[PDB]
């Protein structure tokens, strides 16, 4: 295939938790989206398809997928993060959520990425068991699965994501 060679090389390089035809059609819909994805692609598709109306989290998940900071997000990291969202391990989820919810990227979870997103979490009118470091953060997250996304939303919400993967991964 003139475009499936990308997916073949990507299963050769990256160990996606999705299998052959799944990643073929995933990259096919990526190429449908690009007509390779910029900012506006994220701010539209993760708002309409996914949800999570917090625009700071939109930019933050954009940069977390854009860990290489090329602006035009590459298909390699795009499909890698999408495979993470589809089928990811607990360690992969905690690594991704930690480095994303660290907004400035200081390697930890300081005041500007605890209190600001706590008030993002509070519709205006935790560290007791964690402490912020990744080891004890991981300890309290594997204790309470509520704590996995206790700084930002992320999603993998089943009724959202299993329906979306139902239209994506058309057999």
């Amino acid at each position: 295939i003139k475009d499936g060679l990308n997916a073949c090389c990507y299963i050769c390089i990256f160990s996606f938790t999705v299998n052959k035809f799944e990643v073929k059609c995933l990259i096919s819909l990526f190429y449908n989206l690009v007509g390779g994805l910029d900012r506006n692609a994220f701010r539209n598709i993760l708002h309409v398809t996914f949800g999570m109306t917090d625009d700071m989290i939109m930019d933050r998940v954009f940069r977390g997928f854009d860990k290489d900071n090329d602006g035009c997000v590459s298909v390699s990291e795009w499909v890698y993060g999408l495979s993470v969202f589809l089928r990811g391990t607990l360690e992969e989820k905690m690594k991704y959520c930690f480095e994303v919810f660290d907004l400035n990227g200081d390697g930890f979870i300081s005041k500007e990425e605890m209190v600001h997103m706590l008030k993002n979490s509070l519709l205006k009118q935790t560290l007791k068991k964690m402490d912020l470091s990744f080891p004890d953060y991981e300890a309290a997250v594997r204790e309470e699965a509520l704590l996995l996304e206790a700084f930002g939303p992320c999603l993998p919400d089943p009724k959202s994501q299993k329906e979306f993967e139902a239209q994506v991964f058309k057999d």
């Binding site: 999570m52 509070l122 519709l123 999603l155 919400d157 959202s160």
Partner: protein
């Protein structure tokens, strides 16, 4: 005065019932952090509505809603006032269809809740009328270790529900006797206490005695009269 827990749980309910994913996740984080077994905390959550907002989050598509919600409902359902206002608000029929809703955490933690709810007649008859007896019986059938914990919760729920003749008739019509026989054959002790706890007062009935004798459950009780946890020989002797 109303407790500090009442004040925070009021704020958390306030940004629970009309919030979003992050709001719900951290509000239920603080819910889980608060002392659930405290009776004053149970009354505070009841007075702020609380529980019923958690059934509204069961309706909401997010799933950590359901996980934290039903865990907290189990741990605060130690007392009768909580559960009678559960059925008065109407969240319990909904929780009955959570006993079939696709995620396992839903069914297991909800069956723990009704397991510690169903001391009196109303919860038992609600679960039977809205079908949760038969769906927990299917979870005990295990046609799909995940089945082991969901069946342990369903079995402890049926043990709480094993005083109503209509509930017993529902189990008998659904055919729970051979599948409880196979779960009695299985050596997981955590299932072995409440399965026999259910089967005891279910097998007070004569057709149940005929069924357990047709399936040779007496031999299984003889095999299980010497387990590590002590309570199994009490229940088998019953």
């Amino acid at each position: 005065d109303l407790p500090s827990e009442y004040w925070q749980i009021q704020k958390l309910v306030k940004y629970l019932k009309g919030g979003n994913q992050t709001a719900t996740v951290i509000a239920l984080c603080s819910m889980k952090d608060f002392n659930l077994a405290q009776e004053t905390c149970q009354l505070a959550i009841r007075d702020v509505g609380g529980l019923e907002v958690l059934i509204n989050l069961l309706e909401t598509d997010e799933v950590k809603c359901q996980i934290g919600s039903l865990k907290i409902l189990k741990e605060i359902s130690h007392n009768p006032q909580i559960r009678r206002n559960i059925v008065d608000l109407g969240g319990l029929p909904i929780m009955v269809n959570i006993l079939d809703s696709p995620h396992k955490s839903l069914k297991c933690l909800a069956a723990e809740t009704i397991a510690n709810v169903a001391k009196f007649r109303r919860a038992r008859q609600a679960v039977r009328r809205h079908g949760g007896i038969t769906k927990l019986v299917a979870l005990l059938d295990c046609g799909q270790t995940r089945d082991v914990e969901v069946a342990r919760c369903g079995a402890l729920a049926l043990w709480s529900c094993s005083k109503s003749y209509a509930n017993k008739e529902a189990i008998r019509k659904a055919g729970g006797i051979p599948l409880l026989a196979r779960l009695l054959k299985t050596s997981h002790q955590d299932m072995l206490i409440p399965v026999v706890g259910t089967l005891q007062e279910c097998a007070s009935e004569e057709n149940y005695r005929a069924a357990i004798k047709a399936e040779r459950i007496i031999e299984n009780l003889v095999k299980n009269l010497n387990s590590e946890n002590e309570q199994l020989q009490e229940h088998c002797a019953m």
